[PDB]
């Protein structure tokens, strides 16, 4: 509720949910016609939604044997900001797997450099 967690927190939560729900309807198209059929506006939201999917995921500190690398704790204020940045399109230049199994948004930037060389 905006009057509990804050209006900033609430709007990011609904924003993340909105683009993922809209992506689900877009997933129904790329299943039959493919990626080539989508508009420039469409593949912009798809890439953002796919990056948000992965940024929701994090390595657990009790799951060392499953994911390979150690787990980490992410503060709330850094969580709101992270997804907020992706929704604005601040990381449309970063690769997709940079958001997979990382901590805060700063780790996603560091991983993007590590995929090149």
């Amino acid at each position: 509720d905006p009057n509990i967690v804050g209006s900033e927190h609430y709007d990011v939560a609904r924003g993340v949910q909105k683009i993922l729900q809209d992506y689900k309807s877009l997933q129904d198209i790329i299943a039959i016609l493919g990626m080539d059929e989508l508009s420039e506006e469409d593949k912009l939201t798809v890439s953002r939604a796919r990056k948000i999917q992965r940024f929701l995921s994090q390595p657990f500190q009790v799951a060392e044997v499953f994911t390979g690398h150690l787990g980490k704790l992410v503060p709330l204020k850094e969580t709101i900001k992270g997804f907020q940045q992706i929704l604005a399109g601040e990381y449309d230049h970063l690769p997709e797997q940079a958001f997979y199994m990382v901590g805060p948004i700063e780790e996603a930037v560091a991983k993007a450099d590590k995929l090149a060389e």
């Binding site: 509720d1 309807s25 877009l26 198209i29 508009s39």
Partner: protein
């Protein structure tokens, strides 16, 4: 009854073509118009929790959109339009809302009164 009856039909005309919105920038101009009116009327039906509206406030916000003032307005900023539009009419035109409520209807005087508000509000908003 006045603004609802028009809205009921326009939303029904929308649902018969709404399932084809993913290509909604490639169809005929006639269907694109039905898509536009549909999405704008839907955005009008969205409401926040614990804040129910009086009937005269409801008919005034629906009046915009059902008369086509939101058609050339970005879908995302329809809610931001509504909240500002409602706040303005509550502050400046208590007599208008008070007249729709007391008479229980939309008089031609109240219809013209609302028309001058929305037209001038639109131009300021869309600038």
């Amino acid at each position: 009854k006045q603004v609802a009856g028009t809205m009921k039909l326009e939303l029904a005309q929308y649902r018969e073509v709404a399932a084809f919105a993913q290509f909604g920038s490639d169809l005929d101009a006639a269907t694109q118009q039905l898509l536009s009116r549909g999405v704008r009327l839907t955005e009008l039906l969205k409401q926040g929790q614990y804040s129910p509206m009086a009937i005269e406030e409801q008919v005034a916000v629906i009046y915009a959109g059902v008369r086509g003032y939101l058609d050339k307005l970005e879908p995302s900023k329809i809610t931001k339009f509504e909240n500002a539009f409602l706040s303005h009419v509550i502050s400046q035109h208590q007599a208008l809302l008070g007249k729709i409520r007391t008479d229980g209807k939309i008089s031609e005087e109240s219809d013209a009164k609302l028309k001058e508000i929305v037209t001038n509000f639109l131009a300021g908003f869309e600038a």
